[PDB]
Amino acid sequence: LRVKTDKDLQWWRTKQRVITKRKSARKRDRFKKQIAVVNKKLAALSKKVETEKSNLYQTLYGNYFFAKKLRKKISSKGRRYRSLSLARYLTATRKPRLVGLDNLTKIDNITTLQGAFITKEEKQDSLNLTIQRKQELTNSLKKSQIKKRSRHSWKKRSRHQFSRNHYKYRKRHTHGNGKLRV
Amino acid sequence: EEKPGERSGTNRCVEIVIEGWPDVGNLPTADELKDLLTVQEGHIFEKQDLLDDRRKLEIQYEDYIAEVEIRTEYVDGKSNHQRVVYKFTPHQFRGINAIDIKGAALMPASEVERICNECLPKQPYMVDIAVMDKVRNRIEQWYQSRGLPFCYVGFFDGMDDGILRANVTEAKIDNVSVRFVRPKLTGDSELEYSVYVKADKIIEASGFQRGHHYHVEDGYDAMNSIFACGLLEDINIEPEQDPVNKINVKIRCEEVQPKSMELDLDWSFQLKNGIPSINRQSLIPGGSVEVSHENNSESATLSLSASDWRNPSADLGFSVAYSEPFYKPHTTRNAQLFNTRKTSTIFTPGGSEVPPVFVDRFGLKGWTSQITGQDNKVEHALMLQLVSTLDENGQVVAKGTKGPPTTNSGNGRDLSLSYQGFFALDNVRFINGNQLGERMLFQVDQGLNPLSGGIYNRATASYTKFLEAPFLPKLTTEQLWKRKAPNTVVLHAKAGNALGDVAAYDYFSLGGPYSVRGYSHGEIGAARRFLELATEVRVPLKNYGLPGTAYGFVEYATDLGSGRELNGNPTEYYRKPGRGMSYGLGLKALGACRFEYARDCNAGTGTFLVNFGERF
Amino acid sequence: ENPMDPRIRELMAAEGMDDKLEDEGFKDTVLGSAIINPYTGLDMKTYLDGKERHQAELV
Amino acid sequence: AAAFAAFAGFAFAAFAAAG
Amino acid sequence: GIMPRKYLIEKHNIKVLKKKLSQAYSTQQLTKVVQEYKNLIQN
Amino acid sequence: RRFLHPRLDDNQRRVEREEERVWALRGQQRRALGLHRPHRPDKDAAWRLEQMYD
Amino acid sequence: LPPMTFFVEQMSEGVLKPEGWATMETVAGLGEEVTEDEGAESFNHVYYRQMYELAVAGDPWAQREYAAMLRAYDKGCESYRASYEEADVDANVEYGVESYVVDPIDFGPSFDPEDMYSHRHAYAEAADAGVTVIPSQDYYGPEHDDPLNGIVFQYEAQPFSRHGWGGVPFDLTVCCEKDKTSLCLQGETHVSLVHSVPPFGPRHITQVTGSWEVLRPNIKDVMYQLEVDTFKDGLLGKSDHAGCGLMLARLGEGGDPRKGPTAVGVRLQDTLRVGPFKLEACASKVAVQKEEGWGARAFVGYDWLPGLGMAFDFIQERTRLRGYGANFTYDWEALGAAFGMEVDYVAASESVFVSVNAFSGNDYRLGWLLLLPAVNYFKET
Numbered sequence A: 001l002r003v004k005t006d007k008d009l010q011w012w013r014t015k016q017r018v019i020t021k022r023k024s025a026r027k028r029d030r031f032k033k034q035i036a037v038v039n040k041k042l043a044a045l046s047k048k049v050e051t052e053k054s055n056l057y058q059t060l061y062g063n064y065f066f067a068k069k070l071r072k073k074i075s076s077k078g079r080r081y082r083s084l085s086l087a088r089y090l091t092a093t094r095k096p097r098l099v100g101l102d103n104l105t106k107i108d109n110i111t112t113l114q115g116a117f118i119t120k121e122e123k124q125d126s127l128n129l130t131i132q133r134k135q136e137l138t139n140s141l142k143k144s145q146i147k148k149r150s151r152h153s154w155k156k157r158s159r160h161q162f163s164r165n166h167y168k169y170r171k172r173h174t175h176g177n178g179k180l181r182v
Numbered sequence B: 001e002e003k004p005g006e007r008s009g010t011n012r013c014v015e016i017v018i019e020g021w022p023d024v025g026n027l028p029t030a031d032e033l034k035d036l037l038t039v040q041e042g043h044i045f046e047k048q049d050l051l052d053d054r055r056k057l058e059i060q061y062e063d064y065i066a067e068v069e070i071r072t073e074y075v076d077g078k079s080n081h082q083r084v085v086y087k088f089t090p091h092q093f094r095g096i097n098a099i100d101i102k103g104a105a106l107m108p109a110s111e112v113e114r115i116c117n118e119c120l121p122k123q124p125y126m127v128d129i130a131v132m133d134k135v136r137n138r139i140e141q142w143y144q145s146r147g148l149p150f151c152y153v154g155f156f157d158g159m160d161d162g163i164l165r166a167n168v169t170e171a172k173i174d175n176v177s178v179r180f181v182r183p184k185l186t187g188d189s190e191l192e193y194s195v196y197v198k199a200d201k202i203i204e205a206s207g208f209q210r211g212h213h214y215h216v217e218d219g220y221d222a223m224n225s226i227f228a229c230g231l232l233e234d235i236n237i238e239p240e241q242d243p244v245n246k247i248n249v250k251i252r253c254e255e256v257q258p259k260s261m262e263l264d265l266d267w268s269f270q271l272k273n274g275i276p277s278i279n280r281q282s283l284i285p286g287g288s289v290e291v292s293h294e295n296n297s298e299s300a301t302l303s304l305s306a307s308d309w310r311n312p313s314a315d316l317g318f319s320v321a322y323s324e325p326f327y328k329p330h331t332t333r334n335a336q337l338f339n340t341r342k343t344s345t346i347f348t349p350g351g352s353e354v355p356p357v358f359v360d361r362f363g364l365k366g367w368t369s370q371i372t373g374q375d376n377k378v379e380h381a382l383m384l385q386l387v388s389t390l391d392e393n394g395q396v397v398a399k400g401t402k403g404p405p406t407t408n409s410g411n412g413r414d415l416s417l418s419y420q421g422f423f424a425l426d427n428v429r430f431i432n433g434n435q436l437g438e439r440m441l442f443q444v445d446q447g448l449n450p451l452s453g454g455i456y457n458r459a460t461a462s463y464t465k466f467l468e469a470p471f472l473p474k475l476t477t478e479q480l481w482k483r484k485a486p487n488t489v490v491l492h493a494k495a496g497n498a499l500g501d502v503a504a505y506d507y508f509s510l511g512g513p514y515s516v517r518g519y520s521h522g523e524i525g526a527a528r529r530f531l532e533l534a535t536e537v538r539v540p541l542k543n544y545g546l547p548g549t550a551y552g553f554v555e556y557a558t559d560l561g562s563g564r565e566l567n568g569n570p571t572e573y574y575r576k577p578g579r580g581m582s583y584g585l586g587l588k589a590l591g592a593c594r595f596e597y598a599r600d601c602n603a604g605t606g607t608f609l610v611n612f613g614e615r616f
Numbered sequence C: 001e002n003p004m005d006p007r008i009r010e011l012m013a014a015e016g017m018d019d020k021l022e023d024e025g026f027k028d029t030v031l032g033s034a035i036i037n038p039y040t041g042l043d044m045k046t047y048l049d050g051k052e053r054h055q056a057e058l059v
Numbered sequence D: 001a002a003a004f005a006a007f008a009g010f011a012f013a014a015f016a017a018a019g
Numbered sequence E: 001g002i003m004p005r006k007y008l009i010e011k012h013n014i015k016v017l018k019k020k021l022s023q024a025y026s027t028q029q030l031t032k033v034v035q036e037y038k039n040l041i042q043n
Numbered sequence F: 001r002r003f004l005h006p007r008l009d010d011n012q013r014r015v016e017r018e019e020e021r022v023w024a025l026r027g028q029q030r031r032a033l034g035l036h037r038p039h040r041p042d043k044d045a046a047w048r049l050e051q052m053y054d
Numbered sequence G: 001l002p003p004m005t006f007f008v009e010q011m012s013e014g015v016l017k018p019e020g021w022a023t024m025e026t027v028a029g030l031g032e033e034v035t036e037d038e039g040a041e042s043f044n045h046v047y048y049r050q051m052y053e054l055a056v057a058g059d060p061w062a063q064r065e066y067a068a069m070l071r072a073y074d075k076g077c078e079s080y081r082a083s084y085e086e087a088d089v090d091a092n093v094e095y096g097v098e099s100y101v102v103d104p105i106d107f108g109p110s111f112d113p114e115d116m117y118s119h120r121h122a123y124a125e126a127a128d129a130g131v132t133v134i135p136s137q138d139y140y141g142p143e144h145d146d147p148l149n150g151i152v153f154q155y156e157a158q159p160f161s162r163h164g165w166g167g168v169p170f171d172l173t174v175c176c177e178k179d180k181t182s183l184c185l186q187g188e189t190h191v192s193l194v195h196s197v198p199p200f201g202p203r204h205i206t207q208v209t210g211s212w213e214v215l216r217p218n219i220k221d222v223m224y225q226l227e228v229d230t231f232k233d234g235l236l237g238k239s240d241h242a243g244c245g246l247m248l249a250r251l252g253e254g255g256d257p258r259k260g261p262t263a264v265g266v267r268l269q270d271t272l273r274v275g276p277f278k279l280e281a282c283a284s285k286v287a288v289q290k291e292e293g294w295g296a297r298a299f300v301g302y303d304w305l306p307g308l309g310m311a312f313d314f315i316q317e318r319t320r321l322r323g324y325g326a327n328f329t330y331d332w333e334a335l336g337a338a339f340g341m342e343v344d345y346v347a348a349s350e351s352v353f354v355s356v357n358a359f360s361g362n363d364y365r366l367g368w369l370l371l372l373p374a375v376n377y378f379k380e381t
């Protein structure tokens, strides 16, 4: 009946696996609780303290009983416990393409005919030019291609697989730095 | 919260005067700086506010300003109202006469003249140090807009002769190197690396030649060319400056480990009283044992599940997945062995108390799918599957009973091998939230079964045209180009024909929410040949400023009197062979949700309905 | 008794920390190449900074 | 156990409402 | 190159007064004395 | 095979033409300001990159 | 009406925590970067409300603070408006007239063409509407049509707030499945109320939830449930997270029960640290209209063995079969693999279940480790 006077971060990491698995450790006749009245669709009222503790919401100004114009939603870093991101998967594969407005190429930042990037006024100027000289109503290439299933099967199959394997190895759900921060 | 609000009081600031603030323009203007102060006009203040403002202003604008002094003078002695004056003294040069830029070979002379004319000092004496920073900022902005990040202003000279000259130093790629790394797997939450395609091949694909300028688009293209190889997992490129014109590009690459294994084990012990007995534990259930191997690239996932140990012959399950991403240029080939169960509505329609039947298909399918162009899809599939029928509990049913035959063999379970071709072409485009164009869909199912499936040929052709309304005048979204969704008329024609002997599981039918609104699935008819014609008018509500659109549809389905030709004549059994014509009016809300009231003239019953997904 | 605002204080503390890092980097790149005591690898930077006991414990 | 549970619930509710 | 520096004599005087009152174990007089000194500066 | 096979292929070829146009414009971007070649990948790398994010 | 065991299981969920307020990022920092920390946001809410009250009273400092807050809020709002306009212009520039399309929902493998019916679910991206729409998938669907039937709407708001400070958190969820034959309507609403904050007192929160279910053709009866829960921290110590809740369930035809079967339940929740044990307990008692059921759940941890997780459950029926269950969980790392074990012991049936999950990502050593079932498998004729 003695308290552990010396506490370490690794002890907290070890306890975090138990903390995460306590959600599934609850077993009853219906296993996970909070089902509906006469249907199997589980109700969203799972106000567990562990889950709700690391929950942050924002009142974003979305405009374009009172009117209540402001909209409540999650934004920025979702988790309440912030941790340093792993230095990986920074590079992204991108394909050059033409904007619908004009011959302006667009890979990441939009680039005009010259080497310089397009400016704020130049975009409006191009829009006005294309309004004044509109043509090709329908006979043109289709922008915003209709995505189909199995598209980018390589991406759907192997992208970020090592991260999933690492998560399966860890099963901690909190990287640890957020605890020190708080 | 403003000046007129509190005219009278004590120790209240009346006016804020800013003097000595540099007029370079790169820094915020006088009013912009006033709007960011702690002291506000018409509000109480103390000495702490003045000290905090002085410290903050000194810290945030350290380079330009040498000293900021805040003083207070009484407007009137008795009123106690005061005026707060800010005086700024920046660092200055004893004399600057002309400005010049040296180097910068890539920059044309026009920009050189423009930047020189932009930063002309007004007075040749006591010139502040903001001019050199402005020139540097302009040059850096020009070069960064051009896309070169490493072209920077070196330093400034000519101060002895009073000629502020900015010597721009350019940089070029000098050395390119490669490193091979492998990350390990552990629960330590801190990845460790082990340092170990041809390196020359990587260099050639990147195409980083010495003595060339570095550009962001060049880096993106090199990254794309390097990652074009599917074997590599992660890539990283960094153009670090060499300790000045030399840029050393470092490339780091890591491969992917394809092996993966998932194991499960379940135990059950009859404790009774005291310690349990382990002698009888010959074996234990092993759950599902999953083996995956990604390795060009060939996905291979096997999953074998045993319900219990010491007897795997009962309640066993197998699933196999194979995919080859790079087998063909624009085509991918996959093979899946699996099972699936789904209820049947055409065979056992309600409109009565007909119990539904559940079809179960377990087998293998190998198909090649190609995406030609952007919206054109071609799929060819060969599938061999055991098809069975079970109602309620898992018991095979010989034939449907309220009796039409359930399958072709008559035993409720058979094996069928068949070929299926799917061709989809789409010119439909969504402009301003409204879709216009044409879409063709062709499905062919040929049963090369000569083994109870038999010879069967099912052909389905669907043509949908979203056309601008001829009566409606041209909208502003087409001419002005800028914000209106055009009114649309949708004409849809679906034709389905079946030949040969086809089992009731795959029999063509007519009805269902998608095919004809207002009918339950199988209500209209179940015939080998059918024709569905739908005409809809869709109008956006953007003119009234209301979200969503309003539409009205009329659909007619005709079975061409093929119900009698159908084996067993199911339509006669349930006594609903009548052709249907249903018309309705609906509103499509945000997204694809639709709420429509539809009336069917066959029985004169109107009903509301809500659906998710586009009508056509 | 009129103290400085805590936000400014913390910001300036962080700026001083990065300035100290820059100073340490410059001192290393200027003086760390020389050798004072070859038996313990005592460079000139640590010797002139008064951190000889650091090297003595490190060995 | 019913009486103890009811009494504990009532006492907890009263204590929470008092503050 | 004008780098300002201020002559801080009143601050040092207040600090020395605080030190002298601390050495006499009469800190309760601090707020009584120092305030008066500040008034002496004003007029 | 007499109708579907050419038609869609035409569109595919059409798309290819448009793609080439883009690169031509990129060349102009490299032509101005004396920039070096963008080292465009080969078609063998391109069709593989179709499976990628591209 | 469901049995009292279902209600006792619903009530004994565990330690709960109601949702707090939401805060803007621009106004809170007065245009400066901020981090996340609870207690400093509800303080900002109540503090700005009190300062508004004092400024109305006449205190000049409160007026100055409120004026600064108003200036920051106006600047943030104008910045967001400019950002929205710029984003719209950029979206127009990228795609001239073509609205963005959405990826269709992937159902899975089947013998039907996998690419079929993809066009139906590909719709133009909706505007920045407050509501959220999700499709519902039924178990068995039509053979030749999409298996998606019904829809569910989810909405959240914090109304009655002034300048982004204060308000009443409010959540709503409605699942609607309407066809020519059936009708399924399931609604749920949550409302939060805050009484005090740590700077101005204790943490006192009250959450009110109301859920109703209607199944027209099959059941022809509606069900209502209303629960009120009160949470306060540090009731018997520095922190105990005490909570007490009361629920009422009715199965009347419409509105009032009108002789419909009613049920009343009450729950208590508390966590306490005694010696090396941090114990969390939740006990509830439910009475239907006349059997009474009791339920209790406890989570127990030992700081010397953080890797072991222990949960205890006790359920008592009306007087009086008592079911006791104990669950232990543990984890370890094998050679190139991770093994997690769970042991569940029930004394009512005198049964023990042991489950061991294994994951290996380096090689197939575990596969060669287990080969008994291959020999155990026999043709047997």
Ligand SMILES: CCCCCCCCCCCC
Pocket: D013, D017, G195, G228, G230, G246
């Ligand atoms: C407005 C007074 C503050 C306390 C209100 C308590 C209301 C809930 C108590 C009854 C439910 C257990």
